[PDB]
């Protein structure tokens, strides 16, 4: 009939609706790209040991469905990502255990499939037979839901090369079948699609497809043929046990993250609690002039929390831009409606990102991640873990550990801006190193713009650019007049550019930061 | 014809003969011949045969824009060959205007006329920026005019058509 | 080639192939091969191997101008040998213009042509005053033409190249 409405789209011109689903949720958002975060983690799906991209729209797809709190303690990173995804994009890197395996389907010359599985890392090789094989690369075990492969013949090309349409379909547990995407591929070496795009199986799969890859033997491909097959399902995919992971995997993931060629101005712990991984991340953020937001295990009581920070190794005079948080509270999960406990990097980064978006020219880096306005926890029905234990403000501050407090509306906040600097000078606050690092990064950009130039224009250009940048920062309120007028003069910034030899231009600049108004002391008194 | 009259400068050739707005059957009391028989959408589309459907007001419409091209490239839709043929016809008119002329003025005039015509077509919404930016650049049209001998001027132009939005797939889900 | 097209009289040979302005790789979605491995800057420059870096817009660039000279004098930069070779080629053209001629006009012609060429080059900014005044004087170029026998004219010229401003060292400090 012309009144009927089908279920799944084919190729005819028509509008169809799907059956009324219940066990699915959606979310929408528009990326802002003001400051991109990054950090290693552990999830389902996703290509291991390779930097991905996460926005507020595809985070449910590229990063897979959320894990389960019952299955060990591997549910932290997805919650942390969701907490900090509502402000900007991300650059998460996934790491998997050694026993994780991905499915693979291998075909013979006659066209008979042969199911198999292989662990990650190792390349795929073909024996004397078994002309070509096709395997998934998204990393999904394909156990829930299931992905099937369907191959059908198609029309040959002008040169006479055979072409067969390849279809990948996903079957849900209930019984509904959904087609992902299809394309026309050929086993010939030079088969070209009618629109000019290539049709060789490896190139075609690696060019336009997003789920599968293939490898082809170079000696049997000339005489190899195919047939018609229906519902070829992958079997054997399994990521192993995500709860137990060796430190070597975390180190490799961190090293991979260090070499990713992308802008990111903050590194998050994302639930990583290994001391070596945290130390490596601290080394990372002090090398790119950015600020970390790591934390410690929330299950630790107040007594042993302080030695943990020193056990990390962050404390010192080198990792000055980092910060450590502690959160011994139990909330109600957004997905499973259970009593779960997770860290606090996400809220801290959300506060920082909300602060940096107030200004537009250079960004409000001089705001601290604290207060009612920006940093709000607001998860659900917050309840403490150990009611009997009580903290110690002075000793905890001596250990450079930020605390949480309560707000006006009953939603807890992050009431600290303490970095990981042991020295008691100005840069032991949070916003001062951020301001200095922002100025340094902008100077680095300006200098890179003025490289490899003949003599005569370098000095004036450097001077004017540096002066205009410092003026722009002063106009934003970041820099104020010195609090000591007679000794430091009354100039918010001081500049000097000098030349040393044939090369080695040297530029030195000084500035004064702004106050925070951290502590306030009231004192009532009766006038009677 | 109703679609080509929307524009006035060069005519809206990039519209497809389909939808509620333009293609309405509306004869009288339509009744099928063989009620028992049922069609097959996929096989029928494989045979390059357009179908009819029912609109909002109960008056059936022409819900296809399929041509008679077996190849599965872009010109197997209806409006793309019409757009290309309209551009070709206008170029033929312009070339007929500039025939049998002494050397010196043919190249510049041909170039400027072709550019003006392509710009006029672009302003009508027929041509859009390429969907593949890095490979095809970001120019809706590309032009090149060359001379071969005493005669045999050669002109080559490229362009990108526009989408149709044929298939739409909804998916409701309960939020409970 | 982008650098050499700035000047028009003799060409800007004294520009280095580097920086944001000229050298931009900009292919597509650049991704490293082996993320785990890390380079070594000092060992790499010791081996005379130019490196790549990242620009302001996210497009990687060529951040080095190192030639293949092991000695640590000025000829181990890139633009200095290019400048010297350009001057040598222009002198070769001038000499070929002034070949197989009777005596009496060779010396004056060679001197005036060589001086004019050096003046044209210093006016382009390629040559600058010597960085060491007392020993090298204050003349960007020095010329001397001599005759040896019935044949074998000898011409010697000296010049001083320009800086590159490769390395820059910043140092912030809090004024509290």
PDB file of C-alpha atoms in Angstrom, chain A residues 199-373:
ATOM      1  CA  UNK A 199      36.949  -0.103  -4.712  1.00  0.00           C
ATOM      2  CA  UNK A 200      39.920  -2.228  -3.626  1.00  0.00           C
ATOM      3  CA  UNK A 201      38.907  -3.866  -0.357  1.00  0.00           C
ATOM      4  CA  UNK A 202      41.722  -2.566   1.919  1.00  0.00           C
ATOM      5  CA  UNK A 203      41.649   0.965   0.499  1.00  0.00           C
ATOM      6  CA  UNK A 204      37.846   1.096   0.371  1.00  0.00           C
ATOM      7  CA  UNK A 205      37.481  -0.082   3.967  1.00  0.00           C
ATOM      8  CA  UNK A 206      40.283   2.153   5.276  1.00  0.00           C
ATOM      9  CA  UNK A 207      39.027   5.233   3.394  1.00  0.00           C
ATOM     10  CA  UNK A 208      35.276   5.629   3.931  1.00  0.00           C
ATOM     11  CA  UNK A 209      34.313   2.978   6.484  1.00  0.00           C
ATOM     12  CA  UNK A 210      34.491   3.616  10.218  1.00  0.00           C
ATOM     13  CA  UNK A 211      34.014   0.163  11.779  1.00  0.00           C
ATOM     14  CA  UNK A 212      35.963  -2.516   9.882  1.00  0.00           C
ATOM     15  CA  UNK A 213      39.365  -3.053   8.290  1.00  0.00           C
ATOM     16  CA  UNK A 214      40.698  -5.769   6.005  1.00  0.00           C
ATOM     17  CA  UNK A 215      43.993  -7.364   4.979  1.00  0.00           C
ATOM     18  CA  UNK A 216      44.518  -9.102   1.637  1.00  0.00           C
ATOM     19  CA  UNK A 217      47.135 -11.660   0.624  1.00  0.00           C
ATOM     20  CA  UNK A 218      49.206 -10.477  -2.332  1.00  0.00           C
ATOM     21  CA  UNK A 219      49.629 -13.892  -4.003  1.00  0.00           C
ATOM     22  CA  UNK A 220      46.166 -15.524  -4.092  1.00  0.00           C
ATOM     23  CA  UNK A 221      44.108 -12.392  -4.768  1.00  0.00           C
ATOM     24  CA  UNK A 222      44.297 -12.723  -8.564  1.00  0.00           C
ATOM     25  CA  UNK A 223      42.345 -16.000  -8.730  1.00  0.00           C
ATOM     26  CA  UNK A 224      40.335 -15.555  -5.521  1.00  0.00           C
ATOM     27  CA  UNK A 225      36.540 -15.548  -5.799  1.00  0.00           C
ATOM     28  CA  UNK A 226      33.626 -14.881  -3.456  1.00  0.00           C
ATOM     29  CA  UNK A 227      30.074 -16.144  -2.972  1.00  0.00           C
ATOM     30  CA  UNK A 228      26.820 -15.137  -1.281  1.00  0.00           C
ATOM     31  CA  UNK A 229      26.676 -15.394   2.512  1.00  0.00           C
ATOM     32  CA  UNK A 230      24.065 -14.357   5.066  1.00  0.00           C
ATOM     33  CA  UNK A 231      24.462 -13.270   8.702  1.00  0.00           C
ATOM     34  CA  UNK A 232      28.171 -13.794   9.359  1.00  0.00           C
ATOM     35  CA  UNK A 233      28.480 -12.892  13.039  1.00  0.00           C
ATOM     36  CA  UNK A 234      31.696 -12.094  14.879  1.00  0.00           C
ATOM     37  CA  UNK A 235      32.550 -14.421  17.752  1.00  0.00           C
ATOM     38  CA  UNK A 236      35.284 -14.440  20.374  1.00  0.00           C
ATOM     39  CA  UNK A 237      35.626 -10.710  21.017  1.00  0.00           C
ATOM     40  CA  UNK A 238      36.351 -10.064  24.690  1.00  0.00           C
ATOM     41  CA  UNK A 239      38.219  -7.279  26.488  1.00  0.00           C
ATOM     42  CA  UNK A 240      39.118  -9.464  29.474  1.00  0.00           C
ATOM     43  CA  UNK A 241      39.013  -8.051  33.001  1.00  0.00           C
ATOM     44  CA  UNK A 242      39.236  -4.260  33.122  1.00  0.00           C
ATOM     45  CA  UNK A 243      39.572  -4.071  36.918  1.00  0.00           C
ATOM     46  CA  UNK A 244      43.176  -5.339  37.039  1.00  0.00           C
ATOM     47  CA  UNK A 245      45.627  -3.462  34.800  1.00  0.00           C
ATOM     48  CA  UNK A 246      49.418  -3.430  34.996  1.00  0.00           C
ATOM     49  CA  UNK A 247      51.278  -0.162  35.506  1.00  0.00           C
ATOM     50  CA  UNK A 248      53.105  -0.697  32.202  1.00  0.00           C
ATOM     51  CA  UNK A 249      49.850  -0.246  30.281  1.00  0.00           C
ATOM     52  CA  UNK A 250      49.170   3.036  32.084  1.00  0.00           C
ATOM     53  CA  UNK A 251      52.713   4.215  31.348  1.00  0.00           C
ATOM     54  CA  UNK A 252      52.338   3.385  27.653  1.00  0.00           C
ATOM     55  CA  UNK A 253      48.984   5.175  27.507  1.00  0.00           C
ATOM     56  CA  UNK A 254      50.493   8.257  29.160  1.00  0.00           C
ATOM     57  CA  UNK A 255      53.423   8.219  26.730  1.00  0.00           C
ATOM     58  CA  UNK A 256      50.970   8.007  23.825  1.00  0.00           C
ATOM     59  CA  UNK A 257      49.007  10.940  25.252  1.00  0.00           C
ATOM     60  CA  UNK A 258      52.202  12.993  25.537  1.00  0.00           C
ATOM     61  CA  UNK A 259      52.849  12.776  21.780  1.00  0.00           C
ATOM     62  CA  UNK A 260      49.327  13.579  20.565  1.00  0.00           C
ATOM     63  CA  UNK A 261      49.530  16.670  18.294  1.00  0.00           C
ATOM     64  CA  UNK A 262      46.534  18.603  19.590  1.00  0.00           C
ATOM     65  CA  UNK A 263      45.831  21.638  21.733  1.00  0.00           C
ATOM     66  CA  UNK A 264      44.766  20.724  25.242  1.00  0.00           C
ATOM     67  CA  UNK A 265      45.137  23.046  28.220  1.00  0.00           C
ATOM     68  CA  UNK A 266      44.320  20.668  31.089  1.00  0.00           C
ATOM     69  CA  UNK A 267      45.069  17.057  32.020  1.00  0.00           C
ATOM     70  CA  UNK A 268      42.644  15.180  34.263  1.00  0.00           C
ATOM     71  CA  UNK A 269      43.200  12.134  36.426  1.00  0.00           C
ATOM     72  CA  UNK A 270      40.005  10.527  35.088  1.00  0.00           C
ATOM     73  CA  UNK A 271      40.024   8.016  37.928  1.00  0.00           C
ATOM     74  CA  UNK A 272      43.665   6.988  37.541  1.00  0.00           C
ATOM     75  CA  UNK A 273      45.039   6.235  41.006  1.00  0.00           C
ATOM     76  CA  UNK A 274      48.407   4.586  40.322  1.00  0.00           C
ATOM     77  CA  UNK A 275      51.263   6.667  41.705  1.00  0.00           C
ATOM     78  CA  UNK A 276      53.504   6.172  38.661  1.00  0.00           C
ATOM     79  CA  UNK A 277      50.757   7.283  36.269  1.00  0.00           C
ATOM     80  CA  UNK A 278      50.077  10.391  38.357  1.00  0.00           C
ATOM     81  CA  UNK A 279      53.795  11.208  38.440  1.00  0.00           C
ATOM     82  CA  UNK A 280      54.021  10.831  34.659  1.00  0.00           C
ATOM     83  CA  UNK A 281      50.980  13.073  34.198  1.00  0.00           C
ATOM     84  CA  UNK A 282      52.569  15.639  36.505  1.00  0.00           C
ATOM     85  CA  UNK A 283      55.678  15.498  34.341  1.00  0.00           C
ATOM     86  CA  UNK A 284      53.420  16.065  31.328  1.00  0.00           C
ATOM     87  CA  UNK A 285      51.644  19.168  32.626  1.00  0.00           C
ATOM     88  CA  UNK A 286      54.907  20.843  33.677  1.00  0.00           C
ATOM     89  CA  UNK A 287      56.287  20.358  30.150  1.00  0.00           C
ATOM     90  CA  UNK A 288      53.457  21.855  28.073  1.00  0.00           C
ATOM     91  CA  UNK A 289      52.759  24.675  30.581  1.00  0.00           C
ATOM     92  CA  UNK A 290      49.286  23.486  31.565  1.00  0.00           C
ATOM     93  CA  UNK A 291      47.529  22.601  34.818  1.00  0.00           C
ATOM     94  CA  UNK A 292      46.484  19.183  36.090  1.00  0.00           C
ATOM     95  CA  UNK A 293      43.523  18.303  38.292  1.00  0.00           C
ATOM     96  CA  UNK A 294      44.455  14.926  39.773  1.00  0.00           C
ATOM     97  CA  UNK A 295      43.097  13.469  43.017  1.00  0.00           C
ATOM     98  CA  UNK A 296      43.467  10.520  45.403  1.00  0.00           C
ATOM     99  CA  UNK A 297      41.392   7.464  46.265  1.00  0.00           C
ATOM    100  CA  UNK A 298      38.070   8.632  47.769  1.00  0.00           C
ATOM    101  CA  UNK A 299      37.794   5.551  50.002  1.00  0.00           C
ATOM    102  CA  UNK A 300      40.768   6.661  52.113  1.00  0.00           C
ATOM    103  CA  UNK A 301      39.815   8.118  55.480  1.00  0.00           C
ATOM    104  CA  UNK A 302      40.960  11.570  56.566  1.00  0.00           C
ATOM    105  CA  UNK A 303      43.838  10.186  58.643  1.00  0.00           C
ATOM    106  CA  UNK A 304      45.755   8.473  55.830  1.00  0.00           C
ATOM    107  CA  UNK A 305      44.802  10.944  53.085  1.00  0.00           C
ATOM    108  CA  UNK A 306      47.699  13.266  53.947  1.00  0.00           C
ATOM    109  CA  UNK A 307      50.519  10.677  53.552  1.00  0.00           C
ATOM    110  CA  UNK A 308      49.030   9.675  50.187  1.00  0.00           C
ATOM    111  CA  UNK A 309      49.781  13.060  48.604  1.00  0.00           C
ATOM    112  CA  UNK A 310      53.439  12.807  49.610  1.00  0.00           C
ATOM    113  CA  UNK A 311      53.479   9.190  48.411  1.00  0.00           C
ATOM    114  CA  UNK A 312      52.369  10.498  45.009  1.00  0.00           C
ATOM    115  CA  UNK A 313      55.555  12.537  44.610  1.00  0.00           C
ATOM    116  CA  UNK A 314      53.825  15.632  43.228  1.00  0.00           C
ATOM    117  CA  UNK A 315      54.886  17.712  46.239  1.00  0.00           C
ATOM    118  CA  UNK A 316      57.918  19.872  45.548  1.00  0.00           C
ATOM    119  CA  UNK A 317      58.966  22.974  43.639  1.00  0.00           C
ATOM    120  CA  UNK A 318      58.775  21.527  40.102  1.00  0.00           C
ATOM    121  CA  UNK A 319      55.133  20.442  39.660  1.00  0.00           C
ATOM    122  CA  UNK A 320      53.815  23.879  40.535  1.00  0.00           C
ATOM    123  CA  UNK A 321      50.718  24.019  38.302  1.00  0.00           C
ATOM    124  CA  UNK A 322      49.017  20.823  39.513  1.00  0.00           C
ATOM    125  CA  UNK A 323      46.466  20.321  42.293  1.00  0.00           C
ATOM    126  CA  UNK A 324      45.185  17.453  44.438  1.00  0.00           C
ATOM    127  CA  UNK A 325      41.601  16.873  45.587  1.00  0.00           C
ATOM    128  CA  UNK A 326      39.932  14.533  48.069  1.00  0.00           C
ATOM    129  CA  UNK A 327      36.255  13.566  48.237  1.00  0.00           C
ATOM    130  CA  UNK A 328      35.160  10.984  50.833  1.00  0.00           C
ATOM    131  CA  UNK A 329      31.449  11.194  50.004  1.00  0.00           C
ATOM    132  CA  UNK A 330      28.908   8.805  48.493  1.00  0.00           C
ATOM    133  CA  UNK A 331      26.346  10.072  45.979  1.00  0.00           C
ATOM    134  CA  UNK A 332      23.565   8.521  43.888  1.00  0.00           C
ATOM    135  CA  UNK A 333      24.583   7.516  40.376  1.00  0.00           C
ATOM    136  CA  UNK A 334      22.872   9.137  37.405  1.00  0.00           C
ATOM    137  CA  UNK A 335      22.517   5.870  35.456  1.00  0.00           C
ATOM    138  CA  UNK A 336      22.141   2.871  37.780  1.00  0.00           C
ATOM    139  CA  UNK A 337      20.535   4.736  40.729  1.00  0.00           C
ATOM    140  CA  UNK A 338      22.988   3.045  43.101  1.00  0.00           C
ATOM    141  CA  UNK A 339      25.293   4.279  45.861  1.00  0.00           C
ATOM    142  CA  UNK A 340      28.633   4.907  44.144  1.00  0.00           C
ATOM    143  CA  UNK A 341      31.751   6.919  44.967  1.00  0.00           C
ATOM    144  CA  UNK A 342      34.019   8.636  42.447  1.00  0.00           C
ATOM    145  CA  UNK A 343      36.642  11.367  42.354  1.00  0.00           C
ATOM    146  CA  UNK A 344      36.487  15.116  41.836  1.00  0.00           C
ATOM    147  CA  UNK A 345      38.586  16.080  38.788  1.00  0.00           C
ATOM    148  CA  UNK A 346      35.531  16.618  36.596  1.00  0.00           C
ATOM    149  CA  UNK A 347      33.911  19.313  38.721  1.00  0.00           C
ATOM    150  CA  UNK A 348      37.213  21.150  39.160  1.00  0.00           C
ATOM    151  CA  UNK A 349      37.772  21.253  35.413  1.00  0.00           C
ATOM    152  CA  UNK A 350      34.156  22.292  34.843  1.00  0.00           C
ATOM    153  CA  UNK A 351      34.674  25.216  37.214  1.00  0.00           C
ATOM    154  CA  UNK A 352      37.903  26.206  35.468  1.00  0.00           C
ATOM    155  CA  UNK A 353      36.259  26.025  32.035  1.00  0.00           C
ATOM    156  CA  UNK A 354      33.292  28.087  33.204  1.00  0.00           C
ATOM    157  CA  UNK A 355      35.722  30.652  34.597  1.00  0.00           C
ATOM    158  CA  UNK A 356      37.840  30.897  31.453  1.00  0.00           C
ATOM    159  CA  UNK A 357      34.793  31.644  29.266  1.00  0.00           C
ATOM    160  CA  UNK A 358      33.853  34.924  30.983  1.00  0.00           C
ATOM    161  CA  UNK A 359      36.436  36.910  29.022  1.00  0.00           C
ATOM    162  CA  UNK A 360      36.730  36.615  25.248  1.00  0.00           C
ATOM    163  CA  UNK A 361      39.956  38.327  24.139  1.00  0.00           C
ATOM    164  CA  UNK A 362      42.470  36.250  26.117  1.00  0.00           C
ATOM    165  CA  UNK A 363      40.156  34.356  28.474  1.00  0.00           C
ATOM    166  CA  UNK A 364      39.643  34.834  32.190  1.00  0.00           C
ATOM    167  CA  UNK A 365      42.516  32.691  33.423  1.00  0.00           C
ATOM    168  CA  UNK A 366      42.802  34.767  36.614  1.00  0.00           C
ATOM    169  CA  UNK A 367      39.663  33.214  38.125  1.00  0.00           C
ATOM    170  CA  UNK A 368      39.943  30.567  40.759  1.00  0.00           C
ATOM    171  CA  UNK A 369      37.975  27.307  40.589  1.00  0.00           C
ATOM    172  CA  UNK A 370      35.896  27.925  43.713  1.00  0.00           C
ATOM    173  CA  UNK A 371      32.825  29.627  45.127  1.00  0.00           C
ATOM    174  CA  UNK A 372      29.093  29.313  44.600  1.00  0.00           C
ATOM    175  CA  UNK A 373      29.117  30.821  41.114  1.00  0.00           C
TER     176      UNK A 373
END
